[PDB]
Amino acid sequence: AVVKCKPTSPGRRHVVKVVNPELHKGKPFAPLLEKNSKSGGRNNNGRITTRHIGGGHKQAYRIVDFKRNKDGIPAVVERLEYDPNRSANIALVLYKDGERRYILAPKGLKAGDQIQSGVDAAIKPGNTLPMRNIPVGSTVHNVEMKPGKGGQLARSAGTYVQIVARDGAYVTLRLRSGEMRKVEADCRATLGEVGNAEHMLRVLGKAGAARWRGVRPTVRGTAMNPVDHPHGGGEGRNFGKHPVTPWGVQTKGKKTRSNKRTDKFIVRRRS
Amino acid sequence: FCRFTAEGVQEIDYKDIATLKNYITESGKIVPSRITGTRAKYQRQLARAIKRARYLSLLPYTDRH
Amino acid sequence: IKVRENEPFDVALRRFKRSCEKAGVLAEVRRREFYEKPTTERKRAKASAVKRHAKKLARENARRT
Amino acid sequence: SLSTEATAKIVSEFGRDANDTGSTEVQVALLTAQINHLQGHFAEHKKDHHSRRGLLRMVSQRRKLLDYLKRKDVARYTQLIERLGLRR
Amino acid sequence: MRHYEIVFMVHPDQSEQVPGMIERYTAAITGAEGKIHRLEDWGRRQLAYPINKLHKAHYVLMNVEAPQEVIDELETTFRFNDAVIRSMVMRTKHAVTEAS
Amino acid sequence: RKQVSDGVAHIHASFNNTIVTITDRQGNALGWATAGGSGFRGSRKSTPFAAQVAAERCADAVKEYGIKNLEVMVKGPGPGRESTIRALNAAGFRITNITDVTPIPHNGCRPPKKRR
RNA sequence: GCUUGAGUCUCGUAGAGGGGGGUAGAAUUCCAGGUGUAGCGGUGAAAUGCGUAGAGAUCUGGAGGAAUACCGGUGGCGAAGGCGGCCCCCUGGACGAAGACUGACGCUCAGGUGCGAAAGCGUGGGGAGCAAACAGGAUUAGAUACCCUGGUAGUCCACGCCGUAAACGAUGUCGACUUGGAGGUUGUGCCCUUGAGGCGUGGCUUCCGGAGCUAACGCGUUAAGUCGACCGCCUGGGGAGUA
RNA sequence: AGGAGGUAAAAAUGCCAA
């Protein structure tokens, strides 16, 4: 659950952390691990592309499953494991033949809960099916756009997607942004919503707690010099420049959606 | 004066609408007890049987369907 | 609501409006609810109906008309 | 509910016979059978303050009987609470 | 156990396939040792208001007794069945067979 | 100008104004008239006589379609309730039936606290 | 010791008692369109507003929230606050009949602990309608008001807090006793069910009224009658339920 | 005996003591 800490020291005052007893407290399951090179936001040319990134603490990539290709095979949740790559928490699952795999956790998932996927599976959170066997109005998560690509929608902590309507060969989904989108009706989706819903409630508390998440100090633009930013300069905190990006493009309301390839599928713009 | 199953014992049923349509009106509402002369026990028991029978579309709500 | 008076009616014959509600009811629901005056305006109206009964069998007044 | 099946085992286990549904020791064992039973009911709700008052009567009904029995029959008073595991 | 007075309307196109469903439910309860007392089929009758704009449907009456586990899974079989529309379950009120 | 036999009249007698509309059997509005467009403004717009002369301005402009028999739908109490039907029992229209579609709710969507 | 006070057990009845999870229709608003044509809306009158970019009226379809017409009644329930579509699950309390049991186990209660409308406050959702603030139009001597058009918080949900109301039958709780009458509601017995019955016996409730009491008005077997047991509080008005 | 619908634009103040 979500706990608060007592102000013994400044920096320990405003900290609130989630703590979870059912999280597995040991080593991660070794053969499902690769390394991941932290970049500092730089790319192959070696320049900073995305700013305010770099440092913190080493991590290890856990290969989670997204495709959920095991069909007609029941499986058993071993244990809920912490994952530093996601914002959710994952679960080591044991398929009946012996395979071990990582899936995202549905919120109603205890260790030992028996799931199944494919088309024969029943409506029970933890199962995945193609979305025409899923009844209209359900709550699914980890749903893919292309039929078999993976899963890209509603897979952060405590998110979900309501199935709006089944329009024959397609299906309408309302995303978490408030956007209604068409997806092909033969896409897989995992029932129920993602666990770790108290990720929203977490407040770090001190500046160094941001640092070991891997972020770097954002400098606000109006303090830099005029050669460094479109704002900035003056004699005592001036402004008056219609707030922009550091590359002189209007922010605070300026739409940058220019795709023209997915307007076949966007029913309603979010609001 | 003209009461009902208080001595004609019933457990008022929501399936037999032939007796239920007497105590509805032509517009589809439940008639007061003060006009039908039914007892207060067997009029609450029947208005329960109307809202049940409204759920199974055995009797309409008003007409506007 | 619905009236036909089937073939040779020639004129409105619309008793059906005050027969159920539809004139008197939405000149009640059209405004302020009060949540309290429905208890209050039921108090005096029920008080008047017992005063209406108070003079019914107490008609034994002479006045020599 | 504390069904007619459920209570009939309790009155046999404690009473002078099955017809002895009135004794102090029978009533306390009836209350602790029900006070423990609603502990499962008053976990998930925790905000049903209405029916919680009926439990607090069952608690206070039990408390007044033990203070009567302790004033009366001390040998059975220290028999019951170790037959039930109560009183602090 | 406890009696239950079940009705459920079904889609009129699936009245061609309705009696195989009724044997799944009646073996679910009798396999769980609960008995049945009615099996009244009201049939394809005309509705009074258009549920889902659909007119006339088929009505089933059960009046069965069962333990409370069997009805909860029974509701889910009524929940996820787009052949079935607008089901209903009522409480004990000891039952016998009459009332066509 | 497409001729039709059976039409439907919708009468909306609101408190401030009454607006009549004659449609077809399938809800396509043939023509309409109102008591604001009939010259009367405000107070005189709130009159059963203004309601009767409103359907007389709708008695024509349905003559391109030539409706002989028509249904009547009424909604809203108004002053125009039992007046516009008399604007057609003289105007030569076989009134098949009269229904009423006043939208009585079932206690939703709380009304205003209107004038003290 | 005893049973009449309290309590238990058996069979049942009635209920907006509570908590949780579903579910249905009417309606408003909105969204997409079809038809269609100049107003609509509002008011004491008007204007602001909306509408020829096609409104309003009408029809089909879809989304969303909130509330549950009729039944419904000085009807029922709860300690009070309060509680109203329907269904399930968990669950409190009251009441009735004939028996059985325990044996005064009772009443009241400072401090203490618990519940406690609405509005506020905190976090996270939700947002149809409604509407503090706020804006515009009128009104007016002025109108930072009523009225009109809008409209955010808020009302809704989950969880914490606040702890106050004309939180009022302005009436503390328990028990005993003392004329009646007309009803409501819910049991139950007997008799001819012989038909909307006949006579009882219980619980709860409304109105009238006698003795009595009261400053009067009025209370009047549910007392504000006649007494008993405890508790709370009052001591001229203001200043002040304030420092 | 029972019962339904309809019915106001704003409009202030009057010295101190007897």
Side-chain angles (χ1 to χ4, degrees):
Chain A
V2 47
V3 307
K4 195 200 304 177
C5 192
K6 297 194 65 168
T8 69
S9 69
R12 206 61 187 185
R13 181 178 295 276
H14 309 290
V15 53
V16 163
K17 52 175 187 183
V18 74
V19 61
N20 218 2
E22 67 267 19
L23 255 57
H24 164 58
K25 332 189 69 191
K27 284 271 186 51
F29 173 66
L32 302 182
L33 264 73
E34 315 178 42
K35 77 169 184 67
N36 43 3
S37 72
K38 325 196 86 194
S39 83
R42 291 143 174 81
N43 73 317
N44 52 6
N45 298 106
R47 317 208 159 185
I48 55 172
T49 49
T50 47
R51 316 173 307 167
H52 322 316
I53 291 182
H57 188 215
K58 204 182 299 157
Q59 279 140 44
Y61 188 75
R62 289 90 198 272
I63 303 100
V64 314
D65 192 3
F66 276 138
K67 297 186 175 179
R68 299 290 309 263
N69 303 137
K70 289 308 198 299
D71 296 341
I73 299 176
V76 168
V77 171
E78 294 210 344
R79 55 190 202 250
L80 299 203
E81 300 204 338
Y82 174 76
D83 189 1
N85 309 129
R86 292 309 169 284
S87 294
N89 299 138
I90 53 179
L92 179 64
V93 198
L94 181 140
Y95 286 94
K96 195 196 173 186
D97 42 4
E99 293 208 340
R100 288 193 173 83
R101 255 170 168 186
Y102 277 127
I103 64 173
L104 311 173
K107 85 161 300 299
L109 197 66
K110 283 297 187 299
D113 273 319
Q114 188 191 21
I115 69 182
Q116 195 192 6
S117 70
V119 299
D120 58 75
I123 307 302
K124 187 165 63 66
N127 291 13
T128 79
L129 283 86
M131 310 180 293
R132 57 218 154 90
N133 297 105
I134 302 184
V136 163
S138 89
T139 293
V140 303
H141 74 286
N142 195 75
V143 50
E144 42 179 356
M145 304 180 181
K146 301 253 175 194
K149 186 172 176 173
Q152 305 88 356
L153 308 146
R155 70 183 225 191
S156 161
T159 58
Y160 61 102
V161 156
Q162 200 75 11
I163 294 193
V164 173
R166 183 167 63 209
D167 306 314
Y170 280 74
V171 63
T172 305
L173 301 185
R174 186 208 303 279
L175 309 177
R176 190 63 197 272
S177 306
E179 173 161 327
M180 311 205 205
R181 188 212 151 93
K182 279 177 168 181
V183 198
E184 155 79 27
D186 286 323
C187 279
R188 290 203 175 276
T190 318
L191 308 161
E193 57 196 13
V194 192
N196 199 346
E198 282 79 3
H199 192 297
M200 199 148 52
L201 285 163
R202 186 195 315 193
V203 41
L204 313 168
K206 54 153 159 294
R211 294 308 301 269
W212 52 61
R213 307 304 167 98
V215 317
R216 288 195 41 79
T218 290
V219 184
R220 69 196 205 273
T222 184
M224 312 179 173
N225 268 289
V227 76
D228 296 299
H229 206 272
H231 320 104
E235 268 311 293
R237 310 205 216 201
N238 299 8
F239 212 70
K241 300 177 195 50
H242 290 311
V244 286
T245 58
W247 301 280
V249 191
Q250 174 72 38
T251 181
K252 271 184 186 160
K254 168 100 190 71
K255 303 181 181 178
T256 81
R257 160 82 187 195
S258 177
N259 201 356
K260 288 189 192 167
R261 198 177 40 83
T262 45
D263 302 336
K264 184 51 190 174
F265 319 123
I266 295 191
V267 170
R268 185 181 298 252
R269 154 71 183 259
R270 74 182 196 276
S271 294
Chain B
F1 206 69
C2 299
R3 66 156 188 192
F4 192 60
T5 51
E7 273 203 13
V9 50
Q10 206 43 249
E11 283 133 10
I12 306 293
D13 172 45
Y14 81 111
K15 291 173 292 301
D16 47 356
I17 62 170
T19 170
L20 289 176
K21 284 190 304 304
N22 314 326
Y23 303 132
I24 72 178
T25 177
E26 193 159 355
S27 162
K29 301 169 49 159
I30 319 162
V31 180
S33 88
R34 71 189 203 180
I35 315 294
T36 57
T38 47
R39 291 306 163 262
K41 178 176 180 182
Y42 297 112
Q43 202 271 340
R44 279 169 315 179
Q45 196 140 52
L46 189 138
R48 199 182 322 274
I50 292 304
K51 306 173 207 167
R52 268 163 176 165
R54 281 171 171 177
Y55 182 62
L56 302 192
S57 179
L58 313 167
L59 303 179
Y61 276 76
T62 162
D63 49 327
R64 292 299 95 203
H65 318 290
Chain C
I1 318 167
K2 175 65 184 74
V3 66
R4 192 155 21 231
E5 313 272 300
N6 325 310
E7 200 265 350
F9 44 94
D10 310 333
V11 73
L13 309 161
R14 286 254 273 174
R15 191 168 188 99
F16 214 60
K17 53 182 104 74
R18 94 170 177 116
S19 296
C20 70
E21 61 246 45
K22 279 178 166 278
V25 66
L26 67 95
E28 181 171 10
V29 82
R30 83 283 193 192
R31 279 187 331 127
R32 37 185 71 185
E33 47 171 359
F34 318 101
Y35 194 37
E36 189 270 344
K37 190 182 156 185
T39 316
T40 303
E41 85 174 283
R42 266 166 73 103
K43 208 87 165 169
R44 184 47 165 80
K46 195 86 172 172
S48 75
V50 183
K51 294 188 291 290
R52 271 185 90 122
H53 170 69
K55 260 68 178 177
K56 271 166 200 164
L57 79 160
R59 84 286 183 272
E60 40 185 359
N61 314 123
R63 286 257 66 85
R64 296 282 103 82
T65 182
Chain D
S1 177
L2 212 52
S3 68
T4 175
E5 172 66 30
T7 63
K9 285 166 162 179
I10 308 167
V11 298
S12 62
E13 187 176 0
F14 283 84
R16 302 289 179 262
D17 54 351
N19 311 109
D20 205 272
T21 175
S23 166
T24 311
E25 305 97 1
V26 180
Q27 277 165 346
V28 173
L30 285 174
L31 284 171
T32 320
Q34 193 84 298
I35 278 175
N36 294 338
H37 167 84
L38 274 79
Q39 288 299 120
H41 176 66
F42 286 135
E44 69 273 19
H45 306 318
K46 211 161 286 197
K47 220 186 164 186
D48 174 18
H49 310 293
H50 280 54
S51 66
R52 186 174 267 157
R53 197 162 176 276
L55 204 67
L56 260 166
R57 182 199 311 277
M58 283 176 169
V59 167
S60 299
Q61 187 70 37
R62 189 179 61 174
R63 188 62 250 159
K64 278 177 177 148
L65 264 71
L66 300 180
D67 299 333
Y68 164 70
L69 194 74
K70 152 144 58 187
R71 186 171 61 248
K72 187 70 164 54
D73 198 78
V74 287
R76 274 178 253 137
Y77 166 70
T78 74
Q79 161 59 240
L80 257 59
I81 58 170
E82 279 82 11
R83 205 164 155 194
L84 292 187
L86 58 91
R87 193 52 214 272
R88 298 291 101 226
Chain E
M1 293 73 80
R2 283 165 157 251
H3 326 276
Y4 300 97
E5 298 87 333
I6 319 170
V7 292
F8 57 99
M9 290 163 261
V10 279
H11 192 61
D13 314 340
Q14 272 77 12
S15 178
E16 305 290 327
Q17 66 103 34
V18 71
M21 321 165 72
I22 320 176
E23 304 321 293
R24 287 143 54 199
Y25 310 133
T26 199
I29 176 181
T30 47
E33 297 90 30
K35 274 150 43 61
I36 72 173
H37 305 318
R38 288 190 182 173
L39 195 38
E40 209 195 312
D41 201 297
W42 287 75
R44 195 161 202 261
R45 69 173 281 142
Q46 183 144 339
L47 312 179
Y49 64 89
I51 295 100
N52 203 359
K53 276 77 63 180
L54 184 65
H55 300 314
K56 42 181 69 176
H58 199 124
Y59 285 60
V60 189
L61 175 55
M62 274 200 180
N63 272 8
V64 308
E65 59 96 31
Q68 305 172 296
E69 193 274 331
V70 191
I71 48 158
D72 274 349
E73 59 93 32
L74 192 85
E75 185 268 329
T76 58
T77 60
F78 287 132
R79 176 67 65 211
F80 317 112
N81 200 348
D82 274 308
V84 187
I85 305 175
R86 205 157 287 209
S87 190
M88 211 179 187
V89 177
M90 292 184 207
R91 220 179 161 253
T92 70
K93 321 204 99 163
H94 53 276
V96 73
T97 168
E98 279 96 24
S100 161
Chain F
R1 78 192 70 83
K2 191 264 176 185
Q3 218 76 20
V4 67
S5 175
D6 44 352
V8 161
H10 281 74
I11 318 170
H12 183 92
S14 83
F15 262 110
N16 303 282
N17 188 10
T18 166
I19 312 158
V20 78
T21 298
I22 300 181
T23 178
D24 64 335
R25 190 49 61 87
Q26 300 313 115
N28 291 71
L30 314 173
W32 58 269
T34 179
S38 300
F40 310 106
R41 198 72 260 164
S43 65
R44 288 172 302 273
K45 189 183 54 150
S46 43
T47 307
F49 163 70
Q52 178 164 8
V53 78
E56 293 297 327
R57 274 158 172 80
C58 195
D60 51 355
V62 301
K63 53 167 64 169
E64 271 204 351
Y65 317 106
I67 299 104
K68 310 302 175 172
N69 50 276
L70 56 90
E71 280 80 15
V72 160
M73 268 185 243
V74 291
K75 161 199 294 170
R81 209 155 201 277
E82 264 185 348
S83 66
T84 66
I85 304 168
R86 305 189 193 274
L88 276 78
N89 261 343
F93 290 112
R94 169 72 183 182
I95 312 298
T96 292
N97 48 3
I98 302 167
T99 176
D100 177 90
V101 286
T102 54
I104 175 67
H106 289 354
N107 289 350
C109 61
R110 163 177 174 170
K113 49 167 195 66
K114 271 207 177 184
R115 311 170 194 166
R116 83 180 71 111

XYZ file of all heavy atoms in Angstrom, chain A residues 179-216:
291
model
N -9.655 9.530 -26.428
C -9.620 9.478 -27.876
C -10.209 8.161 -28.326
O -9.801 7.101 -27.848
C -8.196 9.621 -28.375
C -8.024 9.424 -29.840
C -6.727 10.025 -30.323
O -6.309 11.056 -29.762
O -6.121 9.469 -31.259
N -11.169 8.228 -29.231
C -11.828 7.047 -29.754
C -11.131 6.647 -31.041
O -10.998 7.461 -31.955
C -13.307 7.320 -29.983
C -13.976 7.960 -28.793
S -15.740 7.632 -28.744
C -16.311 9.040 -27.804
N -10.679 5.404 -31.107
C -9.838 4.953 -32.197
C -10.344 3.616 -32.708
O -10.790 2.776 -31.925
C -8.396 4.824 -31.734
C -7.415 4.543 -32.834
C -6.271 3.713 -32.334
N -5.706 2.894 -33.394
C -4.681 3.262 -34.144
N -4.107 4.439 -33.949
N -4.231 2.453 -35.089
N -10.286 3.430 -34.022
C -10.606 2.154 -34.641
C -9.371 1.278 -34.660
O -8.282 1.740 -35.005
C -11.105 2.343 -36.069
C -12.551 2.720 -36.172
C -12.932 2.968 -37.612
C -14.434 3.066 -37.766
N -14.812 3.283 -39.184
N -9.532 0.024 -34.263
C -8.502 -0.988 -34.424
C -9.161 -2.157 -35.136
O -10.381 -2.328 -35.068
C -7.882 -1.434 -33.076
C -6.549 -2.140 -33.280
C -7.666 -0.263 -32.149
N -8.357 -2.918 -35.878
C -8.802 -4.170 -36.472
C -9.329 -5.116 -35.404
O -8.708 -5.302 -34.358
C -7.640 -4.815 -37.224
C -7.723 -6.321 -37.379
C -8.662 -6.748 -38.482
O -8.856 -5.966 -39.434
O -9.204 -7.868 -38.401
N -10.491 -5.707 -35.672
C -11.166 -6.551 -34.696
C -10.425 -7.842 -34.394
O -10.749 -8.504 -33.407
C -12.572 -6.881 -35.184
N -9.472 -8.237 -35.222
C -8.638 -9.396 -34.923
C -7.319 -8.985 -34.293
O -6.246 -9.308 -34.785
C -8.421 -10.210 -36.184
C -9.649 -10.983 -36.569
O -10.331 -11.460 -35.649
O -9.947 -11.103 -37.774
N -7.385 -8.271 -33.182
C -6.204 -7.960 -32.402
C -6.372 -8.536 -31.011
O -7.487 -8.667 -30.508
C -5.968 -6.466 -32.319
S -5.151 -5.809 -33.766
N -5.260 -8.889 -30.392
C -5.317 -9.469 -29.067
C -5.363 -8.370 -28.021
O -4.857 -7.267 -28.230
C -4.119 -10.380 -28.822
C -4.175 -11.648 -29.635
C -3.345 -12.746 -29.013
N -3.487 -13.999 -29.740
C -4.478 -14.861 -29.554
N -5.416 -14.615 -28.657
N -4.529 -15.974 -30.266
N -5.986 -8.684 -26.892
C -6.054 -7.754 -25.780
C -6.193 -8.546 -24.498
O -6.907 -9.545 -24.460
C -7.226 -6.787 -25.921
N -5.515 -8.088 -23.453
C -5.562 -8.745 -22.158
C -6.639 -8.100 -21.302
O -6.687 -6.874 -21.180
C -4.212 -8.649 -21.461
O -3.168 -8.884 -22.410
C -4.127 -9.666 -20.348
N -7.491 -8.928 -20.707
C -8.629 -8.426 -19.956
C -8.187 -7.773 -18.658
O -7.102 -8.028 -18.139
C -9.604 -9.551 -19.650
C -10.013 -10.337 -20.880
C -10.558 -11.657 -20.461
C -11.047 -9.571 -21.634
N -9.044 -6.903 -18.143
C -8.760 -6.213 -16.905
C -7.757 -5.098 -17.069
O -7.157 -4.945 -18.132
N -7.558 -4.310 -16.027
C -6.638 -3.191 -16.100
C -5.332 -3.519 -15.403
O -5.230 -4.466 -14.625
C -7.244 -1.947 -15.475
C -7.660 -2.120 -14.052
C -8.579 -1.013 -13.606
O -9.065 -0.262 -14.479
O -8.816 -0.891 -12.387
N -4.330 -2.698 -15.695
C -2.992 -2.886 -15.161
C -2.997 -2.634 -13.661
O -3.713 -1.760 -13.165
C -2.034 -1.933 -15.890
C -0.624 -2.273 -15.606
C -2.279 -1.990 -17.368
N -2.198 -3.400 -12.926
C -2.023 -3.171 -11.510
C -1.168 -1.948 -11.237
O -0.907 -1.115 -12.106
N -0.723 -1.857 -9.977
C 0.135 -0.780 -9.470
C -0.516 0.585 -9.681
O 0.094 1.518 -10.202
C 1.529 -0.845 -10.104
C 2.575 -0.077 -9.329
O 2.268 0.721 -8.452
N 3.828 -0.319 -9.657
N -1.769 0.701 -9.252
C -2.530 1.921 -9.486
C -2.062 3.081 -8.627
O -2.412 4.226 -8.913
C -4.010 1.668 -9.232
N -1.273 2.818 -7.597
C -0.806 3.844 -6.685
C 0.479 4.491 -7.147
O 1.056 5.290 -6.406
C -0.628 3.249 -5.295
C -1.932 3.083 -4.546
C -2.719 1.860 -4.966
O -2.230 1.078 -5.808
O -3.840 1.680 -4.457
N 0.932 4.153 -8.353
C 2.053 4.840 -8.981
C 1.768 6.327 -9.129
O 2.687 7.151 -9.095
C 2.319 4.200 -10.343
C 3.610 4.604 -10.973
N 3.891 5.899 -11.347
C 4.690 3.871 -11.322
C 5.098 5.951 -11.877
N 5.602 4.732 -11.880
N 0.501 6.674 -9.333
C 0.081 8.064 -9.401
C 0.352 8.792 -8.096
O 0.712 9.971 -8.096
C -1.404 8.111 -9.727
C -1.902 9.415 -10.262
S -3.253 9.090 -11.401
C -4.288 8.063 -10.368
N 0.194 8.104 -6.974
C 0.262 8.766 -5.684
C 1.677 9.017 -5.209
O 1.859 9.735 -4.224
C -0.480 7.938 -4.653
C -1.973 8.102 -4.868
C -2.753 7.007 -4.178
C -2.384 9.464 -4.363
N 2.667 8.445 -5.876
C 4.044 8.540 -5.425
C 4.584 9.951 -5.594
O 4.521 10.522 -6.684
C 4.905 7.565 -6.212
C 6.314 7.486 -5.725
C 7.179 6.801 -6.743
N 6.534 5.604 -7.256
C 7.158 4.680 -7.973
N 8.448 4.816 -8.243
N 6.498 3.615 -8.408
N 5.118 10.514 -4.517
C 5.899 11.739 -4.583
C 7.299 11.448 -4.073
O 7.468 10.850 -3.007
C 5.220 12.900 -3.829
C 4.642 12.450 -2.568
C 6.223 13.957 -3.467
N 8.293 11.816 -4.881
C 9.702 11.593 -4.611
C 10.164 12.275 -3.336
O 10.547 11.602 -2.382
C 10.515 12.087 -5.794
C 9.909 11.594 -7.094
C 10.527 12.304 -8.257
C 10.142 10.125 -7.198
N 10.128 13.593 -3.289
C 10.442 14.229 -2.035
C 11.693 15.066 -2.045
O 11.702 16.163 -1.487
N 12.755 14.582 -2.666
C 14.008 15.310 -2.691
C 14.580 15.267 -4.090
O 14.217 14.411 -4.895
C 15.006 14.743 -1.698
C 15.244 13.281 -1.867
C 16.608 12.908 -1.377
C 16.669 11.448 -1.062
N 15.781 11.159 0.089
N 15.476 16.216 -4.360
C 16.011 16.400 -5.704
C 16.814 15.201 -6.151
O 16.771 14.816 -7.321
C 16.880 17.646 -5.755
N 17.543 14.587 -5.229
C 18.321 13.423 -5.571
C 17.491 12.211 -5.906
O 17.988 11.302 -6.571
N 16.238 12.176 -5.465
C 15.382 11.062 -5.827
C 14.979 11.125 -7.281
O 14.677 10.090 -7.874
C 14.144 11.032 -4.945
N 14.969 12.321 -7.858
C 14.770 12.448 -9.290
C 15.984 11.953 -10.043
O 15.852 11.363 -11.119
C 14.488 13.900 -9.644
N 17.172 12.188 -9.483
C 18.415 11.864 -10.166
C 18.573 10.376 -10.371
O 18.985 9.939 -11.447
C 19.603 12.404 -9.386
C 19.657 13.895 -9.342
C 19.570 14.467 -10.723
N 20.656 13.978 -11.546
C 21.810 14.603 -11.665
N 22.010 15.736 -11.018
N 22.757 14.098 -12.431
N 18.225 9.573 -9.378
C 18.438 8.160 -9.611
C 17.304 7.514 -10.381
O 17.354 6.308 -10.621
C 18.731 7.419 -8.309
C 17.807 7.591 -7.192
C 16.500 7.273 -7.164
C 18.137 8.047 -5.886
N 15.972 7.523 -5.929
C 16.964 8.000 -5.122
C 19.306 8.505 -5.293
C 16.921 8.405 -3.804
C 19.259 8.911 -3.988
C 18.081 8.849 -3.251
N 16.315 8.285 -10.812
C 15.432 7.852 -11.879
C 16.052 8.062 -13.244
O 15.477 7.627 -14.245
C 14.112 8.608 -11.829
C 13.421 8.561 -10.503
C 13.201 7.148 -10.069
N 12.810 7.088 -8.672
C 11.556 6.971 -8.264
N 10.576 6.896 -9.151
N 11.287 6.919 -6.971
N 17.191 8.730 -13.308
C 17.894 8.926 -14.547
C 17.702 10.269 -15.189
O 18.128 10.447 -16.331
N 17.093 11.227 -14.501
C 16.806 12.503 -15.135
C 17.860 13.511 -14.715
O 18.627 13.268 -13.781
C 15.394 13.000 -14.797
C 14.414 11.857 -14.879
C 15.364 13.662 -13.447
N 17.913 14.631 -15.412
C 18.910 15.667 -15.222
C 18.183 16.982 -15.011
O 17.010 17.105 -15.368
C 19.838 15.723 -16.444
C 20.776 14.533 -16.526
C 21.922 14.764 -17.495
N 22.459 16.114 -17.408
C 23.300 16.528 -16.470
N 23.712 15.699 -15.531
N 23.728 17.779 -16.467
